[PDB]
Write a protein that binds this ligand. Structure first.
Ligand SMILES: O[C@H](c1ccccc1)[C@H]1CCCN1c1ncnc2[nH]ccc12
Ligand SMILES: [Cl-]
Length: 167
């Protein structure tokens, strides 16, 4: 039993809810919140900008030190950093940004990072401003993640389409 509330169950291990991931994180304080990161951990917009704003820029400060030490992530890769005031940990995961020409096949590799954590709150990778089809992203999620994932979809109109079209 966990404290996630109001999710629709899609499969044995995947759940979904129309919700602002920032507001969800502040309520649940999950062990792991997933950020829709880029390789530079520059949290400018989308989910990343919103999560960072909610940490009063502490996420960005920590991220800049991470990059200075380690260099950029790989597309499809991840790192674990602090969750600050939102969660115990933040798993920064880089899905391909179609608007940069990045290989959509890397979306499965990106979701594989979730399997290193038993329970996660997360957005649909590569969706929104990353330019991929959110319906496709949900399919890859369900077919790749085996751990328990609670998906927050910000756009209510998009949420309804994802549910109604889910196979
Ligand atoms: O799939 C969502 C989406 C939202 C709008 C249009 C298309 C897709 C992702 C991708 C872009 C942002 N987003 C979010 N998801 C959950 N919580 C969020 N808080 C702030 C942003 C955000
Ligand atoms: Cl985003």
């Amino acid at each position: 039993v966990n404290s996630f509330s109001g999710y629709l169950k899609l499969t044995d291990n995947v759940y979904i809810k129309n919700a602002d991931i920032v507001e969800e994180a502040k309520k649940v304080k999950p062990t792991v919140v997933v950020n829709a990161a880029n390789v530079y951990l520059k949290h400018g917009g989308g989910v990343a900008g919103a999560l960072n704003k909610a940490t009063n820029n502490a996420m960005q400060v920590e991220s800049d030190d991470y990059i200075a030490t380690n260099g950029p992530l790989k597309v499809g890769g991840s790192c674990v950093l602090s969750g600050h005031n939102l969660a115990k940990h933040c798993l920064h995961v880089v899905g391909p940004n179609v608007n940069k020409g990045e290989d959509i096949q890397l979306l499965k590799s990106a979701y594989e990072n979730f399997n290193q954590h038993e329970v996660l709150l997360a957005p649909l990778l590569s969706a929104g401003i990353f330019g991929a089809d959110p319906i496709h992203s949900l399919r890859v999620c369900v077919d790749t993640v085996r751990t328990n994932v609670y998906l927050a979809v910000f756009d209510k109109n998009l949420y309804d389409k994802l549910v109604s079209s889910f196979l």
